[PDB]
Amino acid sequence: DPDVAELFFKDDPEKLFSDLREIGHGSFGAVYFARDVRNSEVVAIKKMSYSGKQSNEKWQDIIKEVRFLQKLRHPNTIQYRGCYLREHTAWLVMEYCLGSASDLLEVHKKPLQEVEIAAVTHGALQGLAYLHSHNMIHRDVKAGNILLSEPGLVKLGDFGSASIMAPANSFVGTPYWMAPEVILAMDEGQYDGKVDVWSLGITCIELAERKPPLFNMNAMSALYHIAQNESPALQSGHWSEYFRNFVDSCLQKIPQDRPTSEVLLKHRFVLRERPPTVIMDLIQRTKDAVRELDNLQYRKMKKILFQEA
């Protein structure tokens, strides 16, 4: 318990939080919307069992993650609110969002508007320039790990694969979005946070085209490809040159040619002016459409309306 001492609140989560509903999961275990009893606020809770069979890898992960989460302070990363412990489950509480930019593309079955890709990209990029300014790497940027919360703010989530020190060398991320240099590092190599720049690139395509390139190949093949092959780009002709240059910039296959996140922050793509309501407007079409969905009880996507139930 030295770390339990150092890192957790001592209250019992089962008395603080109620009306848990699962909203996502993964290797760790599930993520839930919940109501904080003390103030009637909604939260997100990521439960991580360390009972499993082998608690060891599991617990270690938990603590590593808490230590990392304790360190963030920026409006474009998901806010961490502390963690609790009962009966071999650590609970990690966080702010709550409507949903991910993926949920956006699953609900409309349509890539977003270019303006909305810009607002989204722009916010994730602030988030990334922040981590990078602290020598952190996310390592798993994708539409899925990009959350929107009203008023209308874009935030990076899932730091499960994150690294506390650039340059790093380990083999993580999700295959289709991985950068060439993360793949090469299987073999004996290293990478910046420019790897998040690459993944942001794929994320742009994914926001523009609903799927990243290579989505239609198994992962090992996609890996051999991303690496050994030439680098993709947006496929339509119809997107501004601004957007198009952004992506080709993020997608420099050679790191020294890839601009840092700090640099992209000033790119014309992300600076061209836009309505201030974009995100909050996006969000609104997004609930309208989920409500205009048939048999709302048999909806994957009903997640988006939880706060109202």
241 is in an annotated binding site: no
| Cα 188 to Cα 28: distance, rounded to the nearest angstrom | 28
Joined tokens for residue 293: 């969905």
Residue whose tokens read 């420019």: 194
**Residue 154 is labelled as binding a ligand:** no
Sequence-ordered list of residues with C-beta below 8 angstroms from that of 226, at least 6 positions apart, any chain = 175, 176, 178, 179, 180, 183, 214
d(Cα 55, Cα 48) in Å, to the nearest integer?
A: 10
CB 97 within 8 A of CB 279: no
Distance CA 231, CA 257 (A): 13
Cβ contacts of residue 186 below 8 Å, gap of 6+?
Answer: 171
Per this entry, what is the length of the chain?
Answer: 309
Sheet holding 89-94, edge to edge: 17-26, 29-36, 42-49, 89-94, 80-86
| Residue 141: exposure state from Cβ atoms within 10 A (0-12, 13-18, ≥19) | buried
Q: Quote the CA–CA distance of 124 and 103 in Å, as a whole number.
A: 16
| Cis before 75 (ω within 30) | no
CB 43 within 8 A of CB 93: yes
Angle made by CA atoms 211, 216, 218, in degrees to the nearest 5: 120
State which fold the 97-309 domain adopts.
Answer: Transferase(Phosphotransferase); domain 1 (1.10.510)
Of 173, 166, 158, 142, the closest CA to residue 97 belongs to 158
Closest CA to 73 of 32, 122, 30, 133: 133
Give the active site residue among 103, 140, 192, 196: 140
SS in 3 state form for the chain? Answer: CHHHHHHCCCCCHHHHEEEEEEEEEECCEEEEEEEECCCCCEEEEEEEECCCCCHHHHHHHHHHHHHHHCCCCCCCECCEEEEEEECCEEEEEECCCCEEHHHHHHHHCCCCCHHHHHHHHHHHHHHHHHHHHCCCECCCCCHHHEEEECCCEEEECCCCCCECCCCECCCCCCHHHCCHHHHHCCCCCCECCHHHHHHHHHHHHHHHHCCCCCCCCCHHHHHHHHHHCCCCCCCCCCCCHHHHHHHHHHCCCCHHHCCCHHHHCCCHHHHCCCCCCHHHHHHHHHHHHHHCCCCHHHCHHHHHHHHHC
Task: Tell me, yes or no, if 257 is annotated catalytic.
Answer: no
- Resolution as reported, in Å: 2.5
Alpha-carbon Rg for the chain in angstroms:
19
Q: Is 197 exposed, middle or buried (0-12, 13-18, 19+ CB in 10 A)?
A: buried
Domain ranges of the chain: 1-96, 97-309
Q: Is 28 labelled a binding residue?
A: yes
- Residue 138 assigned to a binding site: no
Distance from C-alpha of 292 to C-alpha of 14, rounded to nearest angstrom: 35
Cα dihedral across residues 119, 120, 125, 130: positive or negative: positive
| Locus of tokens 């040619």 | 257
Query: According to the entry, how was the structure determined?
Result: X-ray
Which structure tokens are listed for 53? 């069979």
Contact in structure between 130 and 74 (CB atoms under 8 Å) = yes
Span 1-96 CATH architecture = 2-Layer Sandwich (3.30)
